Amino acid sequence: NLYFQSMKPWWWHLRVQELGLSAPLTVLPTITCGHTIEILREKGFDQAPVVDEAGVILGMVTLGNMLSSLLAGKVQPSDQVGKVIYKQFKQIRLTDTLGRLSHILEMDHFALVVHEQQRQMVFGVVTAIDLLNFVAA
Amino acid sequence: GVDLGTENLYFQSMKPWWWHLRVQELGLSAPLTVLPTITCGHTIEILREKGFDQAPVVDEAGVILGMVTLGNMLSSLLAGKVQPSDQVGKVIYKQFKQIRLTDTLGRLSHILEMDHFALVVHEQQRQMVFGVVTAIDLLNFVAAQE
Ligand SMILES: C[S@@+](CC[C@H](N)C(=O)[O-])C[C@H]1O[C@@H](n2cnc3c(N)ncnc32)[C@H](O)[C@@H]1O
Ligand SMILES: C[S@@+](CC[C@H](N)C(=O)[O-])C[C@H]1O[C@@H](n2cnc3c(N)ncnc32)[C@H](O)[C@@H]1O
């Protein structure tokens, strides 16, 4: 067996917490899909966590998944967004590396950034521009 | 499984009422384009400020050279093909789809299912950018109409 280890850039072992992410915009499962589309349109976000009234993360709503579900005849604009909760997305820790982040971002369009306290807490969303801006700046 | 089976069997009668409407129902934004001589770092700043994931790269006459995308910029940076001071001309992406205002929303839907965007070109002048179109443009139309 032969192994290869790449030479890593300066930022590789720096941590997700260096990016300076804001708190996420989240939605309740009971607002409509149409209302969620306006919110996401206003902000220029492709996704948001869906959280219940007790603060539990139920999953993510994404534009891709809303579009698929609409095409499949399964959701309409006036339905609750709870109907299109996407439950399989990637998580990363606030103290995980930018290297790990970069792997996730190459395969997925976002990750939910998590931090461990007495329970596992959501810190924010992270997407390619957050990493790009950091490296560029 | 069974749902895919149903959607395949009745694909024709499950086509949305708007399937054969045209992309021009969407009324898009004016496009933000860049020349190939601005840097990758400045491209990243511009796209960050607007909240766009992609822009057309055009020449001094407005002729489309291709697209710059965040995903391809990231890959190119990871592979060491460019650094931020390099011209964005070094990462012109060409494997995207162009469509016209007269193309159906159905054609657009197929494209958006696989890619993050399409480039809308001028109906009789396919070398010029009309606008960019992404999922939220189609979603916004359907929510408006329903
Ligand atoms: C403006 S959006 C542009 C589109 C991009 N594909 C996206 O969805 O992030 C990019 C910026 O918004 C942030 N962002 C995305 N979704 C978020 C949300 N639900 N809450 C707060 N920030 C979010 C990203 O972390 C990034 O800083
Ligand atoms: C604010 S962005 C949000 C993130 C989304 N993933 C994207 O890149 O379009 C969505 C809106 O910006 C528009 N848009 C995207 N790229 C653009 C560009 N280069 N010039 C003008 N509008 C653009 C889209 O057509 C859509 O109306």
Residue numbers in the entry:
A (entry chain A): -7 to -1, 406 to 515, 526 to 545
B (entry chain B): -14 to -1, 406 to 515, 526 to 547
Paper text:
Cystathionine β-synthase (CBS,3 EC 4.2.1.22) plays an important role in methionine and sulfur metabolism, and is a unique heme and pyridoxal 5′-phosphate (PLP)-containing enzyme. Its canonical role is the condensation of serine and l-homocysteine (Hcy) to form cystathionine, which can be further metabolized to cysteine or glutathione. CBS adopts a three-domain structure encompassing the N-terminal heme binding, central catalytic, and C-terminal regulatory domains. In mammals, the activity of CBS catalytic domain is increased up to 5-fold by the binding of S-adenosyl-l-methionine (AdoMet) to the regulatory domain, an ∼140-amino acid stretch harboring a tandem module (CBS-1, CBS-2, collectively known as the Bateman motif) found in a number of proteins.
